[PDB]
Every structure is written in C-alpha cells, then in structure tokens.
Subunit: 210 residues, 4 copies
Amino acid sequence: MSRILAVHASPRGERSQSRRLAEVFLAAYREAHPQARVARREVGRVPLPAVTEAFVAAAFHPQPEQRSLAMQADLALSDQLVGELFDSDLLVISTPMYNFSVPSGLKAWIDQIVRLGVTFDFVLDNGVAQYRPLLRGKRALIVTSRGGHGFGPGGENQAMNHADPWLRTALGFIGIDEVTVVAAEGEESGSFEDSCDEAEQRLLALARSA
Amino acid sequence: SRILAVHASPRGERSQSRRLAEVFLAAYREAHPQARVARREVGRVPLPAVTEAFVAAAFHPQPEQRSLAMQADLALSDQLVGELFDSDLLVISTPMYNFSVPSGLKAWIDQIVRLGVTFDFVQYRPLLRGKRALIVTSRGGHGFGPGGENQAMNHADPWLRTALGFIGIDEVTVVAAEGEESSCDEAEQRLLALARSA
Amino acid sequence: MSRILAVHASPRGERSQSRRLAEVFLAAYREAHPQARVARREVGRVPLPAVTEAFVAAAFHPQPEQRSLAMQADLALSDQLVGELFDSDLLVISTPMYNFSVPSGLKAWIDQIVRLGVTFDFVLDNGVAQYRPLLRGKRALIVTSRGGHGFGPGGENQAMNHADPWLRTALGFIGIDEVTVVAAEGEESGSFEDSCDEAEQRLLALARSA
Amino acid sequence: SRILAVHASPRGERSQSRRLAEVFLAAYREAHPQARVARREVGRVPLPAVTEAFVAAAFHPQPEQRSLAMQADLALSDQLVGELFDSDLLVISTPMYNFSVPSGLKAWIDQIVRLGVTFDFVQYRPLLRGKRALIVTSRGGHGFGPGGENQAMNHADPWLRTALGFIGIDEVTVVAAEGEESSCDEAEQRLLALARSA
Ligand SMILES: Cc1cc2nc3c(=O)[nH]c(=O)nc-3n(C[C@H](O)[C@H](O)[C@H](O)COP(=O)(O)O)c2cc1C
Ligand SMILES: Cc1cc2nc3c(=O)[nH]c(=O)nc-3n(C[C@H](O)[C@H](O)[C@H](O)COP(=O)(O)O)c2cc1C
Ligand SMILES: Cc1cc2nc3c(=O)[nH]c(=O)nc-3n(C[C@H](O)[C@H](O)[C@H](O)COP(=O)(O)O)c2cc1C
Ligand SMILES: Cc1cc2nc3c(=O)[nH]c(=O)nc-3n(C[C@H](O)[C@H](O)[C@H](O)COP(=O)(O)O)c2cc1C
Ligand SMILES: O=C(O)CCNC(=O)c1ccc(N/N=C2\C=CC(=O)C(C(=O)O)=C2)cc1
Ligand SMILES: O=C(O)CCNC(=O)c1ccc(N/N=C2\C=CC(=O)C(C(=O)O)=C2)cc1
Ligand SMILES: O=C(O)CCNC(=O)c1ccc(N/N=C2\C=CC(=O)C(C(=O)O)=C2)cc1
Ligand SMILES: O=C(O)CCNC(=O)c1ccc(N/N=C2\C=CC(=O)C(C(=O)O)=C2)cc1
C-alpha cells in the first residue's frame, strides 16, 4: 500500500547496473503489491534543465501569488516534479557515482524540487533564518553503482564519497530522514558479481517488508 | 600566467561569486598586464550532461579507432579539456546550491575528467601538472567552512577539491562568502591580496 | 465549452508580443467561458529536448508493446505532450518569426508530437507508404509576431515565410486542418501599434465566437 | 578550400545524410590533399535555443559596452560565427523532419545570424561573401524536390536557402536522397562528381 516515485539517473539503459538493480526492487515490490502505483521519472537518459536566474526570481518571489504567467511558466516543470514527490510515499533513486558525485541530471532534479514555501520554509529568529522541512511521511531508497571500491562506510575512500552522503543531506533538508542506501562496487573491474548479488538479496528483502 | 575562468552562477550582475571572481581577475590583470584570461561560462548557458554515447566514446578501448560520430560526441569535451591544458591558474566561481554546486558545474567536471587525457589507469594517476586553482564561492547560510557547525554538510568546494585532485590539481585555495541570504568585504580584500602575488 | 492547449514559443516574457496577444485571446475566451479549461505548455522560456536517435528507435519500433522500460522513458515527455493535445479541443500557438521560421523550441515540440501510430499512421499500397492523420475534431489558432513587413498573403516577402505556412503543413499532417493565423508585423520598426490593435480586435472577435 | 561541415542528424552510422556528406568530404580531400575540414555537430549534441539574454546581447544598441555577462551569453555564438568566417565551403547534412529540419539545425542558424556580424541594417545587407554551400539532405518520402507533387510542403532546404541567402551565402547546391522510409546511388555519384571539381 505504498505509492512509489522511481527516479532513474543513469544515462545508460539496459547496461545500467543502478537502473537494473532498482527495477529488481520495483518488480519485487510489484509482486507483493499488485495494486501499488509506481511512477517513473527519467533524469538520466533525458535532459533536465539547470536552474536559471528566471527560476531563482520566481521561486524566491516575496509575494508568490503575484508571479506573472511567464514566472509561473518558469516554475511549471518544478511544480510537476514536486507534485510527483508529494503524491508518493516511497522515493527510489537509482544513480551511478560520476566523478565522486552524482550525474548532473540528478543534481538538476534536486535543484528543481527544493522549493521555498513548498518543500522547505524558514523564519528569522533574531535575524537568523531558521529552516523547516515541509515533506513528512516520506521514505527514500538510494540504489547506487560504482566503478571503484571502498566508498562505503569504513572504506578506504569513504572521504571521497560525495554522492549518496550528499543525497542524504539534501533529502533530509526537505524532510526525508528515513533513507536507505544499497550499493554495488567494482563495476569497472567486473567479485562485482558478488557485490551485485548481495545488492539484489538486500533489495528483495526490503521489497518484501516495505 | 594564463588563466581559465569558469563561472557557475546562472546570475549575471546579481551574482556574488561572479562579481568577486571578477574583482580578483581585474586585480590580477593590473599586476600582470600580459596575462591572458579565457572565460568558460557554465552557469548562464547550458552544458550538456554525459550521455551513453559519451561513455562509449570516452572509454573506448582503442581511441585511435573512434569513428567520426564518436569523435563528435567528444568534441565539446576536447575543447573544454584543451582550455584547461592551455592554462596555469584555474579560477572557478560558484554558488552553493543545495549543499553542492549548480548542475552546470557538475556537468563541466563530467566533461573534463577523461581517461587517457586528464587521468590514466595502470591504480589511477593524474595527468595534469603545474596547475593551481582558486575557488570562489558564495553561500546563503553560515558555518559551512573549516571548523563550522555545518562543515559536514558542505559538498560543494570539498567535492571540487576531490575531483580536481583526481586529475592532478592539488594546489587549491578556497575563498568563501557566507550569509548572502541573511564577509564579502573580507573575501574581497582576501582576493585582492591574493591577486598581488600570483 | 472548449478545452484549450496554449503553447507559448517566445523566449521573452512580458516583452513578448506574440505571448501578449495570445493571452489577450485566452483572457477574452475566459470571460465568455468561466468554466473552460486552459492548459499552458511553455516551449520558449524553457528548453525542449531535440529528437535523439534513442527517440527514433522507440517511436518507430515495429512492435511497440515490446519497448523496454528505458525505451519508454525515451518517449515519456512525448506521451505527455501528445496527451495534452488529445485532451484539448483548441490549440493556440504563439510564436515569433525567427530567421524566417519558428524558434527551435517550437520545432522541437512539433518533433515530439508527430508520433507513428499516435498522431499519424500509414499503410503500404503497392509498396508505397500512405499516410493518415489520427487527430480529429481539433482546431488551431496561430498567433505570430514579426519584426519586418510583407510576410503575409500578398506581401512582398511572402515567399520567405517558412514559419506559419510550415506550421499549417505540419499540423495538417496530423489532422488539424482548421487553422487560423493572426499576425502582427513591423515589431522591429515600432504603425506597429496599428498592426497590434488590428490583431487584438481580430482575436477578441474569435474568442467571442469560439 | 577550407570546409566547415555541419551535421544535423541525431543518428550516427545509421544516418544517410551524414554518410553521404562524409562520402563527399572524403572525395574532396583526395582531390585537394591540403584541405582543412572543421566539423560542427548539431544533431548528436544539443545546441542551446536563443534565450531572452541572447536577444538582449545580440541586439545591444552599443555592442562595445556589452558587459562580461552579456558577452558570455554570446560566446557560443561568436565561436559558431567564427567557424563560418574561417571557411570557404559550408557543407550541411540534414534529414527532413516534419517538413523542415531537426530543431538542432534551426538552433544553429539562430546562433549565426547576428546583427553587425553576418548582416547589417541601413534595409538589410548580407555581410558574408565569397562563400558557397552544399546542402545534403535525406528524406523518408518522395516528391519534395523541384517539380515534385509535394514541393510546396518542403520547408527544409528551401528555408535553408532563404536563411543562408540573408547573410550572403547565395551559391547553394542541394543534393537530395528520397525514399528512405520506403536515388542514394545517384546522389552519391552526384556528390563524387561535385567533389572532383570544387
Ligand atoms: C563519467 C563517469 C564518471 C565516473 N566516475 C566514477 C567515480 O568517480 N568513482 C567510481 O567508483 N566510478 C566512477 N564511474 C564508473 C561508474 O560509476 C560505474 O560504471 C557505474 O556502474 C555506472 O552506473 P550505471 O551502471 O548505472 O550506468 C564513472 C563512470 C563514468 C561514465
Ligand atoms: C537553488 C538554490 C539553492 C541554494 N542552496 C543553498 C545552500 O544549500 N546553502 C546555502 O548556504 N545557500 C544556498 N543558496 C543561496 C545561494 O548560495 C546564495 O544566494 C549565493 O550567493 C548564490 O550565488 P551567486 O550570488 O553567485 O548567484 C541557494 C540558492 C539557490 C538559488
Ligand atoms: C533571433 C531572432 C530572429 C528574428 N528573425 C526575424 C525574421 O526572420 N523576420 C522578421 O520579420 N523578424 C525577425 N525577428 C524579430 C522578431 O520576429 C520580433 O521581434 C518578434 O516580435 C519577437 O517575438 P516576441 O515579441 O513574441 O518575443 C527576429 C528576432 C530574433 C530575436
Ligand atoms: C522525427 C522524424 C520526422 C521525419 N519527418 C519526415 C518528413 O517530414 N518527410 C520525409 O520525407 N521524411 C521524414 N522523416 C524520415 C527521415 O527524413 C529519413 O529517415 C531520413 O533519411 C533521416 O535522415 P538520416 O538518415 O540522415 O538520419 C522523418 C523522420 C523522423 C525520425
Ligand atoms: O589517497 C586516497 O585516500 C585517495 C586516492 N585515490 C584512490 O585510492 C581511488 C580513486 C578513485 C577510485 N575509483 N575509480 C574512479 C574514481 C573517479 C573517476 O572519475 C573514475 C572514472 O572512471 O571516471 C573512476 C578508487 C580509489
Ligand atoms: O541536523 C543536521 O544534520 C543539520 C541541521 N540543519 C542546519 O543547522 C542548517 C541547514 C541548512 C542551512 N543552510 N541554509 C540554506 C540551505 C538550502 C537553501 O535552499 C538555502 C537558500 O537560501 O535557498 C539556504 C544552515 C543550517
Ligand atoms: O528580394 C527579396 O524578395 C527579399 C530580400 N530581403 C527583404 O526584402 C527582407 C528581408 C528581411 C525582412 N525582415 N527583417 C528580418 C528578417 C530576417 C532576420 O533574421 C531579422 C533579424 O532581426 O534577425 C529581421 C524584410 C524584408
Ligand atoms: O493535401 C496536401 O497538401 C498534402 C497531401 N499529403 C501527401 O501526399 C504526403 C504527405 C507526407 C509525405 N511524407 N511522408 C513523411 C512525413 C512525415 C513523417 O514523419 C515521415 C516519416 O517517415 O516519419 C514521412 C508524402 C506525401
């Protein structure tokens, strides 16, 4: 009985390991819940617009009900993206690690959905902005694939990981505090089979209990 | 020194990080009248994301055999990398957006980290050398710098160091302006001082 | 009692004459029909993806029910764009003339909505593909603004007009044969006031009778 | 001759218009071993649309006073125009998409028609001279060429002539392959003949 939003961030299709692993979760979830709604939002194989100055002017307008129609057009994609999120209970993000972070498309999706007055708010206490998240009741699953090894907790390269740790922080800011990460490592060295098998078993167990 | 200046804010006149970087650049020019500055805009104009075509071309096992179509998939990348090779000092100006950098700057990084060109594999090895970087960043909030209560939330410039470090840019200076949504004088003064000695 | 799809193609906001003139029509239509639905689709101030080879492979797939999930993701924007069109009775397009044609964003929107099996079909008679439109019951209004003069019927530069004449042809291919064009000329020379006044009077009359 | 080759199909190996243009280019190179070819991809990589920032910059009443931000809005445009100025023969390969050209090619045209640079106003005047163009186009259907039953539906190459003509490219040859969805030998042979004399 969960409404799902699945956001796919790899540019690769059938060859994407993070997409493949997320679809394993999604299809397993579907077996346990034949009537559940799954919405898919592509941010890897299709371009997502970067934040523009026109976006900034509209999103942060002091009196939002006065936005011109052109300004509203600047926020239209964002509203649709935010709407999908509000209409979901569980958010699944699949993503590669690209250069120690996420693909630029995912960063752009994040930039569209953190919206003043919509997914976060603030007040000034003694002149200092205090921030409050506006999403509530959400969960998130991050499914990730990496070419190298050691980027996870306790790993030799843990300090170079600005992908899922950064995702955690951004999602938490808008109120998604329950976040699970499943990772496959060693993709470039292909061992990697063990890593993917373990990721699949983990996701199957999460699907059953979700 | 030859300077490549990468601007990441979508804002023009209103941008603090652009304005501060331009303060430095004008002061560096006075102290070194023969300096060349190349500007690469990644904030006010779109920069394409990495695609599957790009992955196939960039990681081609036998680059000398890339087809014309594959080379076309890498043309922007080659141009971007070329700008970096022809420079001594890299200046990057950027906002913090959602605890990281604007998507355009991430896209720029994704284009210039290139197997066989800016890094190699034997174990990974940087292929750029002799370069320095100055990162100029503006943020709406407070406490994202060294020793700050929000330091562990900062995935902008610390991530930049990691990516720059991987391709061999080790000498990196960060000058940050905080409290934009609520220091610029200090950052400015710091940038002028820096310009008078680089 | 018409459902409206308004597609705005100028990159300019408050300064857009074609956008301004179309909103005049839309607000006049709204006065006569308080309960009518108007959907707005921005193709000028926001990027619209160009057709890719991945798009081609999916749209023209011989057995569409076998498209992979990745392929479907390649068509997702297109489906949403086509859906807006099917859900409308009247299509309003506002557009500048740019270099004797339309802005690239509008061309991209057109490239997304002409879809095999969806807005057009074909069969082979003696080996020759015969095309059949799939949209029916639609009308279209094209509102256009031009910097120069003489691009309309009988004008000295009529043969250089590949904007609205080309729109007519593309819309007709998918079945929109009832098409009206309202044009303001002389924008770069600013006379132009006469041209805009006449365009407004024309659009107000069309709104009342629609 | 110096050649600028603009490719408009999103397709790679499978593209007919790209393949035919490459047949011509290879044959022109054999006949003129010292020729330089610049390739500009507008089909397989995105090309930005004109924005309002671009309009404000390009039609600036006093260009010498454009701010750095405005110049950045025109950087791609300047690079694209530069390629055109440095060439003698422009070769454009393109599909017909929906009775016109792919959106990328329209975007390319929108970037290179520039007030004060490729055309002027006194009455409009072309500023490019001494250039030729070869347009190589592939179409799925039949009868879109001169004397064809669908000639009045053709807004691809005839529109290209109008846009090219406005900026001063008057000498234009069109070679078309039709019936792709259902002539290439002829077009090919025609391209080889053309290469052996340009
Ligand atoms: C542009 C690019 C950047 C990459 N950066 C990293 C990286 O920083 N660290 C890493 O371990 N692997 C990196 N990789 C390897 C990918 O993370 C790995 O191939 C991953 O499985 C790709 O995700 P996908 O299979 O879902 O497409 C990179 C790959 C590409 C194409
Ligand atoms: C989309 C967006 C996201 C932002 N995210 C953060 C943030 O995570 N932390 C912060 O301190 N400020 C944030 N800000 C505020 C900007 O960092 C601040 O306005 C900065 O000065 C913008 O850079 P610029 O002036 O060079 O355009 C954000 C602003 C925008 C528009
Ligand atoms: C890039 C560009 C190309 C243009 N090309 C033409 C043209 O080919 N013919 C013409 O008469 N006006 C041309 N114009 C002028 C515009 O058509 C005119 O300013 C129009 O009103 C702009 O539409 P808008 O007001 O809705 O933004 C062009 C303007 C721009 C910015
Ligand atoms: C989106 C799209 C639109 C097309 N529109 C037309 C058309 O209007 N008329 C036509 O004859 N063929 C049309 N075609 C068929 C192509 O013109 C034909 O496949 C051509 O060879 C493609 O060029 P390329 O092989 O260089 O990629 C269209 C194809 C696509 C994918
Ligand atoms: O000394 C220290 O703590 C750290 C020193 N560096 C390491 O140990 C190290 C670095 C990268 C890595 N992953 N492969 C990657 C990383 C980044 C990429 O962009 C690509 C790519 O294919 O583009 C592949 C595993 C280990
Ligand atoms: O419990 C934990 O791990 C962390 C506890 N949260 C904090 O103390 C905190 C969070 C964010 C912050 N930055 N403000 C920002 C962040 C996002 C924006 O979009 C803007 C904006 O101006 O648009 C400004 C300062 C302090
Ligand atoms: O001899 C013949 O039949 C035709 C000879 N040319 C003409 O008479 C003529 C050309 C253009 C025009 N409109 N202004 C324009 C046209 C194209 C543009 O790109 C721009 C722009 O601002 O970018 C403005 C009016 C008349
Ligand atoms: O009555 C009138 O004005 C016109 C009468 N219609 C005709 O005779 C006619 C129309 C289109 C055509 N080209 N085929 C095309 C057009 C669009 C496509 O997307 C494809 C494709 O392969 O995807 C191929 C040939 C003939």
